[PDB]
A paper describes a structure:
Of particular interest is the [name] HD100 nucleoside diphosphate sugar (NDPS) hydrolase [name] because it appears to have some of the characteristics of the Escherichia coli adenosine diphosphate ribose (ADPR) hydrolase and the guanosine diphosphate mannose (GDPM) hydrolase. Bd-NDPSase is a homodimer whose monomers are related by a non-crystallographic 2-fold axis. Each monomer comprises an N-terminal and a Nudix domain. Phosphate release assays revealed that among the nucleoside diphosphate sugars hydrolyzed by Bd-NDPSase, its highest relative activity was with GDPM.
The B-factor of the E140 Cα in apo Bd-NDPSase is 3.1 times larger than that of G115’ on loop L8, and 1.7 times larger than that of Y19 on loop L1, suggesting that loop L9 intrinsic flexibility facilitates substrate binding followed by E140 mediated nucleophilic attack of the scissile phosphate. A product-release mechanism where an arginine (R37 in Bd-NDPSase) completes a “fence” around the nucleoside is posible, but the presence of a sulfate ion in close proximity (4.5 Å) of R37 in the apo structure precludes this analysis.
Residue numbers in the entry:
A (entry chain A): 1 to 182
B (entry chain B): 3 to 182
Write the structure that this text describes.
């Protein structure tokens, strides 16, 4: 769909905060005119759907100050210096929840902020789990929970799983558990 | 127990589009940390279901990711208006359609780590086809999509836009008689 593409004419890093880095670009759009585009430079991420032998999934509660709310989430974290996201996922599953998994399957990649960040999140299904113990980062506060997939889907419908990556995980899990996508 | 207490707030950056809030917070360990996030106006996204069973979707380039995306139409809340008003306006501007039947589905948060953005998702039915009225810097092509085709595209990784993918999943639940 080449007639929709925009051509980068210039880029700069316009701002660096404590955490957020902003790129500002001038682009040539399909009209041949120049427009500004601004977006966050993000390292990428992974998220894991950790399926226990008992059929429950391992989830977390975590407070997110950007939204001033505690969210139910699948474990996740940012990609460290261009590592494969499978490594990110293994590490985050262990650090946030204490689990390791013998069976990892890449499901899909999502883009959560197409208007203003280059973030992508690779979503994985982790099976054949065994437990060790949690190891949280400085400034990271997490409660680990087990959730029945049926209860999770009802929470989705009720608006109680508003975190996009985790809601998408729930729907992919549902497709997997029903044997539709497996 | 997990909640962090705001100690101070500052708008540290305002560009052409993006505004960054930086807060000092006291966390559950009693210690102080910085939190940085985008101040976003909020947004609406619309699933427009045609009488033939297809949905109206768009193709749109997104410079932040350097790809053309398949999306449901959407846009940002203006002057803190009711998001249904946002939805009705953006459905007309981006696709050329109006709808006489609107239903709120759910609110999603696409960037919990670094933006206060929420998106309210709506189902739109009973449609009338007028014409697009695109805004500055907007280039959008309208396409009709069969929901079964949409779900296969999701599986294939060809619907990576979170809001759109979630919309597909909700539509699938509605069309299957599961959620109504």
């Amino acid at each position: 769909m080449k007639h929709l593409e925009e051509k980068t004419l210039s880029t700069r890093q316009i701002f660096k905060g404590r955490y957020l880095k902003i790129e500002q670009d001038q682009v040539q759009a399909p009209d041949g005119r120049t427009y500004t585009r601004e977006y966050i430079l993000h390292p990428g991420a992974a998220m894991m759907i950790p399926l226990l032998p008992n059929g429950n999934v391992v989830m977390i509660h975590q407070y997110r100050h950007a939204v001033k709310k505690v969210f139910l989430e699948f474990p996740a974290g940012k990609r460290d210096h261009n590592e494969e996201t499978l490594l990110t996922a293994k590490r985050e599953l262990l650090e946030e929840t204490g689990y390791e998994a013998k069976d990892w399957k890449f499901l899909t990649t999502i883009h959560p902020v197409i208007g203003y960040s280059n973030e992508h999140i690779d979503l994985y299904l982790a099976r054949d789990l065994t437990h060790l113990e949690q190891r949280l980062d400085q400034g990271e506060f997490i409660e680990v929970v087990e959730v029945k997939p049926a209860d999770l889907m009802q929470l989705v419908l009720e608006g109680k799983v508003s975190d996009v990556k985790t809601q998408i995980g729930a729907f992919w899990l549902d497709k997997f558990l029903r044997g539709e996508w497996n």
